[model samples]
Target chain A: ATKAVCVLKGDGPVQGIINFEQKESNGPVKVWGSIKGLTEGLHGFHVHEFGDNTAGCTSAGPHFNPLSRKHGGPKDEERHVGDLGNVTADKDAVADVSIEDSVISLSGDHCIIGRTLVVHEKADDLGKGGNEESTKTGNAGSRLACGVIGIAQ
Target chain B: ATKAVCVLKGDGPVQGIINFEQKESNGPVKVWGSIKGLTEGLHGFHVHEFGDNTAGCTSAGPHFNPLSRKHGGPKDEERHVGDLGNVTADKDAVADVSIEDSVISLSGDHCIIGRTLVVHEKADDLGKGGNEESTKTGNAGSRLACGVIGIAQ
Candidate 1:
């Protein structure tokens, strides 16, 4: 199903909106969103395992790593499917990002519907930091904001 | 304007699902859910402030206490709107509980939609203990499982 948009809610200055467009079954997934309430710099962004957000961003769990792959940039072949890399905010603490990802989908195992999209507090090292956390989490700090991936009407 | 069913996800031995149903616009919110992987006993259950779960259950933050009232049982008139009391698990470590709450809804300031539902690790003291944490959180231990309140189709 094609989803128009999903609203994201957060506390104390973390909030935004996102949308997923799937023109065809085999076409790449188009992701677009604008997020605010961030510090100026790069922040880790990824799809998490659960659409459940009862407990905040952490309740979504780690990056949507269903394949059990290592942490890498959005372009890496050997990375978690949920890895969308980072979104940089301007001095105004606002970030607008748009991308088409081959791995993201609205259907099948990679389907992000009923999942979670997360924004982190710090920049992700993207598996090049030569540290243990790099492979697991890319050392992204706390989760700043999160939204569930929902099917749009 | 009825919404679709919102699903909650869990981790480890705390896996289960939960959803809320509101039949009428001004009717009581009926919470129905079956959760598995809990220890044999009673566990505190409540709605949370934020729908974000990026950092696991803790990230969901405190209970959805918009009234700033003392923590009490689900039936208490002067209690946090999110306080739904406890669920009991049997020997097999499963719990199926249902209740109709007047304070919770699918819309309005008391609306739980886009909020959270959480199952705690320990039984809630229910503010009778007179301890600081009791009044704060009912002294409910670590979060065992969590899910967000979403619109059901």
Candidate 2:
């Protein structure tokens, strides 16, 4: 499997390993991970800018939006390149996130290899929250967990 | 050179590129960089615990202390692996950093790959400020700039 892995580690209860792969240069990237210890609900997730959580999850910078695009769902044509929408945690407070996103790639300008992956504390509104920060952040609140996309395999 | 590069970018005036190299398996590692837009003074620099700065510089977690050692000067035997001491900026508000550290490596238990490098708002006390926060944090204060250490070459 031509995949890269990102292991989420922090001081909080959240823990997980997210793997990514792209067989073709222009193909949709495959993303999957099992994140445990989230609240039993939906949480926003994305590739954030500058994988440098020196102080904590908040120090991971903002969402990876090199295109300077607005925030939206993964399928939205006008969404930020880092947007992956949301992951649903089961009743056991676990999120088995598996997704294929055409917007992000593993070997392109939007490649997330050296970036940060984040799980938000609240559900991603996907630009439909009709609030002030919705269009730019999906209104996703504080970072719950995050990890850097590191060494490839 | 067997080296890795890290570019620091943020919304502030501080920006630079940091480079790392470790030629021998058991030899010391080399660290160097050029940073600008800092005050004409000294600032703390270090390899934080994570490379996940998804929110900002603060989220990069704490100092990279897998050994859980106390915070001290870069040359102190009782120091954390992440400690590189401090960097001085010139009168022009630019800093040219060059270092060869025996404490860190590009590959080892102290490997700093996928970690965050931080420039603090104040000088690192090097565990000698004679204050409560000094022993643990060196009292480096807020993060002025940072970047995630990424890909190898």
Candidate 3:
């Protein structure tokens, strides 16, 4: 399987890694990764607007919103271009989140090829029964991890 | 005493009414109140390192940490003391976050009583920065919005 991985670690700090693999199915992109040797509990995870990992993770910016949109959950039928949603962690402080999104495409002007990934401090209330917009990606809560995606040429 | 006021519309564009007052002195207790519209779940926040409140909302530096503490949740149970964790928002996205942190105690440590407030694009990573000392607010992602914690007294 083809995949794109983004790693962040400055100086002698513990490194953070994110691996993205488009699952073999007619569905949204598939993202799965793990955070090691850290605290535990649930954390925020979502796709971002831009694809610049310069300022460490700050460059990822809000969920990639080529189109001006509102904040929302990940499962919302309609949401911000970058509203992928949060990732849950086990007691070991490790998170493995798998989400299938439709809006995320590799072709077209809204393709997420160069988009970024971000994690937050809380969980995303899936846009259901009148929740926050599934697209807003909930507001920029906290920044846990960040990684940019690339299409295999 | 001169100060700056920063504002943010995180989660949703909210009509934030920050009612805070500084102490007479010696006590770094600069009390304040915040009300957000409605949000999905919780969001991490802090008094950034700087107070720029530029055009959009990129002026505020990172979280205010003169002591150079690690990144953490706005209110972690056993997380770093610096990780103030997050402020909860009800289903209505309505939140009333209040605190009397010793960091805001007498001797005027960092003086966030009149500093800038920063809303994030996502929740904080707390110590999920994926590093040895990832205790730097999880490297949560952006500086959504900002406001100053002012004082009336």
Candidate 4:
């Protein structure tokens, strides 16, 4: 089995860790992490295009759009490679998240290594809103926390 | 040189690294790191009592006041072991900090190896505010970023 990890850091009250697990090559990556200190509601989450943290999370650049597709949910067949969609928090401000993603990989151009993972402050519209930003970013607001993906130990 | 390190993380915009460097076992550790994405002003920095980041920075508990002394500036003869005073960010929102702390060591009970380093949102008043929280927390605001100290490579 092969796995990767990332430690999400931010300036506010939110924090968490992300783990990418895979059984073999050309297989789905099990994306999961336990995040805490969030508002009790929906928040947008995705992998951005860059990995640089020199200027904070914003230095990670835009969303990973290698396929040049529109921003959509993880269930959408025509969505960008970075689109993993939303994760909701509970009353205690924690979100226990897990998902199996196909568009992302630990190898090749779709590889998430050296990329940036971001948790946004707003709920992703999931391409439902009829707006330009919706298609471009899912309308997820400012980033709350971010981390650089790296190969797991 | 014997050195230890800490990687600061948060959920907002603050971020940076901290290094504890010492050339001798009983000599002062020269602490330094270039941190960015901070508010342009003074912010409280300290070594907390714990290294656990499982529940975010706050879980690290109070300052490392092992000597049972009141919270004071780093230069004060009688002060908390964690009292390294404040680090100021410039107009560009960056704090290139360097300090020689005599009270903290890389060895013994003062060993910060498993403890946490923190950066607060407000300036540490150095217990001079003449208030209750002042004596306790230096009136520093919410924790902005924190890192667990570790043995450096």
Count of steric clashes across candidates, in order: 23, 29, 64, 7
How does candidate 1 score on lDDT?
0.76
> Candidate 3 — which residues are off by over 4 angstroms?
A1-3, A8-16, A23-27, A125-140, B1-153
Residues B1-153 of candidate 1: C-alpha lDDT, one tens digit per residue = 433234445566786667666778687877676888889998998888765555556666788887889888887776888899899999998898777788877666676655657899899877776678888788889888775554343
Decreasing lDDT order of the candidates: 4, 2, 1, 3
Q: What is candidate 1's lDDT per residue for A64-100, written digit by digit as tens?
A: 8778899999889988988888989999999997888
Q: Work out the TM-score per prediction.
A: 0.54, 0.56, 0.41, 0.53
What are the lDDT scores of the predictions, listed in order? 0.76, 0.80, 0.51, 0.81
For model 3 chain B, the run of ten residues with the poorest summed lDDT: B1-10
Candidate 4 CAPRI level: incorrect
Report lDDT (Cα) of residue A136, candidate 4. 88
Winner by DockQ: 2
Candidate 1 residue B3 C-alpha distance from true site, Å: 19
What range of 10 consecutive residues in model 1 chain B has the weakest lDDT sum?
B1-10
What DockQ would you assign to candidate 4?
Answer: 0.03
- What's the CA error at residue A117 for candidate 4, in Å? 0.7
Best by lDDT: 4
For residue B103, what is the lDDT in candidate 4? 83
Q: Which stretches of candidate 1 lie over 4 Å from their true place?
A: B1-153
- Model 3 Cα lDDT, one tens digit per residue, B94-143: 76766555454322445543235555555666776657635655555665
i-RMS for every candidate (Å) is 7.8, 7.3, 17.1, 9.1
